[PDB]
Design an enzyme around this catalytic site. Structure first.
Site, PDB file in Angstrom:
ATOM      1  N   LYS A   1       0.584  -1.010   0.021  1.00  0.00           N
ATOM      2  CA  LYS A   1      -0.571  -0.140   0.278  1.00  0.00           C
ATOM      3  C   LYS A   1       0.844   1.299  -0.066  1.00  0.00           C
ATOM      4  CE  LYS A   1      -1.497   1.687   3.661  1.00  0.00           C
ATOM      5  NZ  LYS A   1      -3.133   1.260   5.023  1.00  0.00           N
TER       6      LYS A   1
ATOM      7  N   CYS B   1       1.861  13.656  -8.091  1.00  0.00           N
ATOM      8  CA  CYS B   1       0.939  12.479  -9.535  1.00  0.00           C
ATOM      9  C   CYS B   1      -0.309  12.087  -8.569  1.00  0.00           C
ATOM     10  CB  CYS B   1       1.523  11.936  -9.684  1.00  0.00           C
ATOM     11  SG  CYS B   1       0.959  10.803 -11.221  1.00  0.00           S
TER      12      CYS B   1
ATOM     13  N   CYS C   1      -1.773   9.988 -11.234  1.00  0.00           N
ATOM     14  CA  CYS C   1      -2.611   8.922 -11.775  1.00  0.00           C
ATOM     15  C   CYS C   1      -1.554   7.785 -12.160  1.00  0.00           C
ATOM     16  CB  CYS C   1      -2.755   9.671 -12.972  1.00  0.00           C
ATOM     17  SG  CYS C   1      -1.254  10.347 -14.076  1.00  0.00           S
TER      18      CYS C   1
ATOM     19  N   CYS D   1       4.313  13.703 -10.217  1.00  0.00           N
ATOM     20  CA  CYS D   1       3.187  14.758 -11.789  1.00  0.00           C
ATOM     21  C   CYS D   1       4.962  15.086 -12.584  1.00  0.00           C
ATOM     22  CB  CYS D   1       2.647  15.514 -11.274  1.00  0.00           C
ATOM     23  SG  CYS D   1       2.031  15.682 -13.234  1.00  0.00           S
TER      24      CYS D   1
ATOM     25  N   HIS E   1       0.275  12.252 -16.981  1.00  0.00           N
ATOM     26  CA  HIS E   1      -1.660  12.228 -17.227  1.00  0.00           C
ATOM     27  C   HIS E   1      -2.311  12.690 -18.514  1.00  0.00           C
ATOM     28  CE1 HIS E   1      -0.361  16.579 -15.787  1.00  0.00           C
ATOM     29  NE2 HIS E   1      -1.423  16.688 -16.093  1.00  0.00           N
TER      30      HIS E   1
HETATM   31  S1  FES Z   1      -1.426  13.691 -12.283  1.00  0.00           S
HETATM   32 FE1  FES Z   1       0.710  11.919 -13.369  1.00  0.00          FE
HETATM   33  S2  FES Z   1       2.143  12.403 -14.086  1.00  0.00           S
HETATM   34 FE2  FES Z   1       0.256  14.024 -13.429  1.00  0.00          FE
END
Ligand code: FES
Ligand code: FES
Lengths: 64, 69
Positions: B18, B35, B37, B46, B50
């Site tokens: 986790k 990030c 995603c 990030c 995304h």
């Molecule tokens: S939210 Fe994952 S790379 Fe931007």
């Protein structure tokens, strides 16, 4: 395969921005897109991980 | 087969059951962009990944920014 299934779908790209001054002691942010309190974590990741075998969890921003 | 439910994180740190990150604000500088995603090569930060995720899947996910007022 989308990651976000239901949150704010009328927004073509969901980005949140907070000032550290407004955060207080601790903020716990959702990274699974299943929280009912999104962008904050409400424990929904646990059921997500259970159902899917995934290992995602939140981001915690806190005062030292 | 809808019994098999898709994971969100496909590849990051799979030996960790986790994945949670915790940061102190004082250590963050003027701005930190995180990030949400699970596709960034710089996770938990990030790196723009995304965008490609959203174009490929029709999703609308994006990062979390923490900064100074
Ligand atoms: S939210 Fe994952 S790379 Fe931007
Ligand atoms: S509810 Fe999504 S990471 Fe906790």
């Amino acid at each position: 395969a989308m990651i976000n299934l239901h949150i704010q779908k009328d927004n073509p790209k969901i980005v949140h921005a907070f000032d550290m001054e407004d955060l207080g002691d601790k903020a716990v942010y959702c990274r699974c897109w299943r929280s009912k309190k999104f962008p904050f974590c409400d424990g929904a990741h646990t059921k997500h991980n259970e159902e899917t075998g995934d290992n995602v969890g939140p981001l915690i921003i806190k005062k030292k």
